[PDB]
Amino acid sequence: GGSPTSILDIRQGPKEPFRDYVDRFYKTLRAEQASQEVKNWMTETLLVQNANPDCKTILKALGPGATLEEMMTACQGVGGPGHKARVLAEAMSQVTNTATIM
Amino acid sequence: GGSPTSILDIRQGPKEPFRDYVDRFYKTLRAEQASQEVKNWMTETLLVQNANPDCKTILKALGPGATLEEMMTACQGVGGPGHKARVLAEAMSQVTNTATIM
Amino acid sequence: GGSPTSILDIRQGPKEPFRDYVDRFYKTLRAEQASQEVKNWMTETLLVQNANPDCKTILKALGPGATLEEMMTACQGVGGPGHKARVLAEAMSQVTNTATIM
Amino acid sequence: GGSPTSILDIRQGPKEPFRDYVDRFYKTLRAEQASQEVKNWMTETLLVQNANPDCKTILKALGPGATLEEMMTACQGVGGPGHKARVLAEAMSQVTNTATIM
Amino acid sequence: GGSPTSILDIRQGPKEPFRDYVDRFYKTLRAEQASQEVKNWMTETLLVQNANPDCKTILKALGPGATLEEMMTACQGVGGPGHKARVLAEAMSQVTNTATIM
Amino acid sequence: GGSPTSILDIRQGPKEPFRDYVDRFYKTLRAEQASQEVKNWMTETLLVQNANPDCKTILKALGPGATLEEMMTACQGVGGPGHKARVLAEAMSQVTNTATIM
Numbered sequence: 001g002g003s004p005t006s007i008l009d010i011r012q013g014p015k016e017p018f019r020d021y022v023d024r025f026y027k028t029l030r031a032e033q034a035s036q037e038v039k040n041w042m043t044e045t046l047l048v049q050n051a052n053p054d055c056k057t058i059l060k061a062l063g064p065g066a067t068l069e070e071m072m073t074a075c076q077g078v079g080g081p082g083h084k085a086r087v088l089a090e091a092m093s094q095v096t097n098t099a100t101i102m
Numbered sequence: 103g104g105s106p107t108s109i110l111d112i113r114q115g116p117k118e119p120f121r122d123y124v125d126r127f128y129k130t131l132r133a134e135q136a137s138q139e140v141k142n143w144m145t146e147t148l149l150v151q152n153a154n155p156d157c158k159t160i161l162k163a164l165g166p167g168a169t170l171e172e173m174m175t176a177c178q179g180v181g182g183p184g185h186k187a188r189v190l191a192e193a194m195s196q197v198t199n200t201a202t203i204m
Numbered sequence: 205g206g207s208p209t210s211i212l213d214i215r216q217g218p219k220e221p222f223r224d225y226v227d228r229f230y231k232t233l234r235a236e237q238a239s240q241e242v243k244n245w246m247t248e249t250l251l252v253q254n255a256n257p258d259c260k261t262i263l264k265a266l267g268p269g270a271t272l273e274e275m276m277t278a279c280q281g282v283g284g285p286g287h288k289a290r291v292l293a294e295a296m297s298q299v300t301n302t303a304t305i306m
Numbered sequence: 307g308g309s310p311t312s313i314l315d316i317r318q319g320p321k322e323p324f325r326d327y328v329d330r331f332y333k334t335l336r337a338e339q340a341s342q343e344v345k346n347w348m349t350e351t352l353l354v355q356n357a358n359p360d361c362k363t364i365l366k367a368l369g370p371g372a373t374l375e376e377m378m379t380a381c382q383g384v385g386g387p388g389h390k391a392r393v394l395a396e397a398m399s400q401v402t403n404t405a406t407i408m
Numbered sequence: 409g410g411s412p413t414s415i416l417d418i419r420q421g422p423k424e425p426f427r428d429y430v431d432r433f434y435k436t437l438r439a440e441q442a443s444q445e446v447k448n449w450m451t452e453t454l455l456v457q458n459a460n461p462d463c464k465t466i467l468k469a470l471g472p473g474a475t476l477e478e479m480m481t482a483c484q485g486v487g488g489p490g491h492k493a494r495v496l497a498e499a500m501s502q503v504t505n506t507a508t509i510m
Numbered sequence: 511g512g513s514p515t516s517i518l519d520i521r522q523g524p525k526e527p528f529r530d531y532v533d534r535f536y537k538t539l540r541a542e543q544a545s546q547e548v549k550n551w552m553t554e555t556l557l558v559q560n561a562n563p564d565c566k567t568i569l570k571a572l573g574p575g576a577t578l579e580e581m582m583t584a585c586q587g588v589g590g591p592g593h594k595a596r597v598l599a600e601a602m603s604q605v606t607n608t609a610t611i612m
């Protein structure tokens with residue numbers, strides 16, 4: 001309880017990129033004595049959960065566990081104005097154009 | 103009054119995701135020398151009251167004080183990018199289609 | 205007048221949680237010499253008048269001086285997506301659906 | 307002459323609150339050796355023209371002559387999630403309902 | 409390339425007021441051994457190019473050849489909520505009232 | 511491989527201006543022992559790929575290979591309010607007016 005660097009608290013800021021935070025999930029796992037597959041609940045899940053919902057709305061479409069070159073190119077969409085370029089419109093199309101409910 | 107790290111002032115930074123804040127509610131409790139049940143208002147309900155309403159509006163849907171993993175996945179959208187990806191659009195259609203008041 | 209933080213101007217950040225600013229307000233209440241009832245204007249009404257329009261606007265809805273526990277909950281909306289979810293939902297439909305003037 | 311901050315341009319930030327920058331120019335008039343009365347037209351006029359379009363827009367609305375406590379009271383409307391929260395209902399409604407031009 | 413503070417890489421933060429940054433541009437211009445006219449490229453067009461698109465768009469409206477106090481006056485609008493109130497609203501009116509395309 | 515700051519991972523902060531990050535990519539290119547022609551592929555492509563999608567959507571529009579002055583001028587639009595001033599008008603019109611899908 002209250003244990004840091006175990007990924008149980010690693011976190012990507014709203015404006016913090018997936019790539020940069022990945023270093024926080026990799027590097028903070030360096031501090032953690034684990035197995036490579038063990039780290040996979042992270043690389044795949046806490047990397048997808050605590051990491052900037054842009055990554056959720058992204059890794060949910062792109063998919064999770066996408067290679068570091070894929071989740072990179074994609075989660076590079078993550079970002080304050082960086083995602084506003086793409087996500088801004090998406091929510092705007094989630095309501096009116098593409099995902100308009102009823 | 104003004105006692106720190108007792109959960110009474112632990113709060114979800116409105117931008118701090120539900121996790122960043124839960125963690126704070128957890129680890130800082132290590133410092134708070136309390137009873138396990140006492141920590142239960144602190145985990146269930148503080149985590150539901152002074153926790154940035156983004157996680158509250160969710161937490162209710164999830165059920166208040168639901169398991170941390172459960173409130174975590176749902177409230178991971180709490181934090182910036184999620185509530186902006188999703189809730190911007192949700193409330194928007196609450197106003198127009200789903201929740202049109204009168 | 206203008207003595208350091210006499211309450212007369214204590215400030216809540218546009219995003220600073222009410223509980224937090226309240227920490228500054230209380231902290232500076234200590235700095236100024238006021239009877240408790242005298243501090244009551246300082247708590248009940250200043251807190252409403254000069255504390256981040258996120259709370260002050262609400263504080264009009266709860267009425268000036270709603271018990272700090274009620275107001276704590278009201279002003280717990282203060283925040284980015286936590287506040288803006290509500291403010292967006294209310295303002296967006298005020299203009300179009302709920303309060304469309306003329 | 308016109309050395310920095312003599313009430314030449316004492317500028318207010320965008321989110322920097324009115325009481326924060328008002329505290330600065332008062333302090334900066336101290337930086338300027340002028341008549342007490344001189345400082346009066348400096349605090350009433352120059353302050354208003356060069357300070358935060360949020361409080362500059364308010365300052366016009368209150369209209370000059372508003373005692374500082376009254377200025378800051380209206381300018382307490384200033385702020386990102388703070389003024390924006392009031393600007394959603396205030397300005398987002400100018401384009402559509404209140405200030406619909408032609 | 410990447411020459412320190414040669415104006416070419418001097419920049420205005422997206423939020424940085426026009427002036428705060430101009431203090432930088434100028435402050436280093438004094439350091440860049442240049443002719444007055446040369447400094448005038450830095451003031452007329454670079455000043456614009458490397459300066460916060462809130463205002464970069466403005467300085468065109470103002471158009472080059474305007475006094476620094478002229479651009480500054482128009483650029484007190486520069487700012488997050490400072491500029492959003494006038495310009496976000498302008499954008500709000502760019503979709504609905506005045507700049508409605510097609 | 512994937513040595514730090516070898517350009518393979520150089521990145522632009524979402525808010526980090528294009529010009530700023532470009533200084534991180536160029537400077538770090540100095541750290542990268544690469545043929546100039548190689549560096550060119552890094553300046554043309556990699557600069558485009560990991561440099562803040564604000565620019566990615568811009569550089570794509572301008573066309574890859576645009577001169578740094580050309581990428582810069584447009585990417586000076588990169589930024590929070592700075593890119594938002596344009597992008598908000600754009601994405602908003604991508605859903606409703608110009609890019610309305612179906």
Ligand SMILES: O=P(O)(O)O[C@H]1[C@H](OP(=O)(O)O)[C@@H](OP(=O)(O)O)[C@H](OP(=O)(O)O)[C@@H](OP(=O)(O)O)[C@H]1OP(=O)(O)O
Pocket residue numbers: 014015079080081116117182219284285288386387422423488489525589590591
């Ligand atoms: O994206 P950045 O340049 O890093 O800064 C952003 C941006 O603030 P600006 O108005 O200065 O551009 C957000 O503004 P929005 O476009 O989302 O309105 C703001 O949002 P809020 O005013 O709603 O708080 C957000 O904060 P957040 O991520 O908490 O939503 C804040 O980021 P930082 O606080 O991390 O600097």
Ligand SMILES: CC(C)(C)c1ccc([C@@H](Cn2cccc(C(F)(F)F)c2=O)NC2Cc3ccccc3C2)cc1
Pocket residue numbers: 014015054078079080081082083084087088091182183184185186187188190284285288289496598
């Ligand atoms: C209500 C609030 C929380 C403050 C909010 C809401 C929506 C957004 C983004 C979209 N959006 C959606 C998901 C993720 C991103 C992220 F940044 F994380 F990448 C993103 O940009 N659009 C608005 C931003 C803004 C500011 C003032 C004027 C207009 C707009 C449009 C940003 C913040």
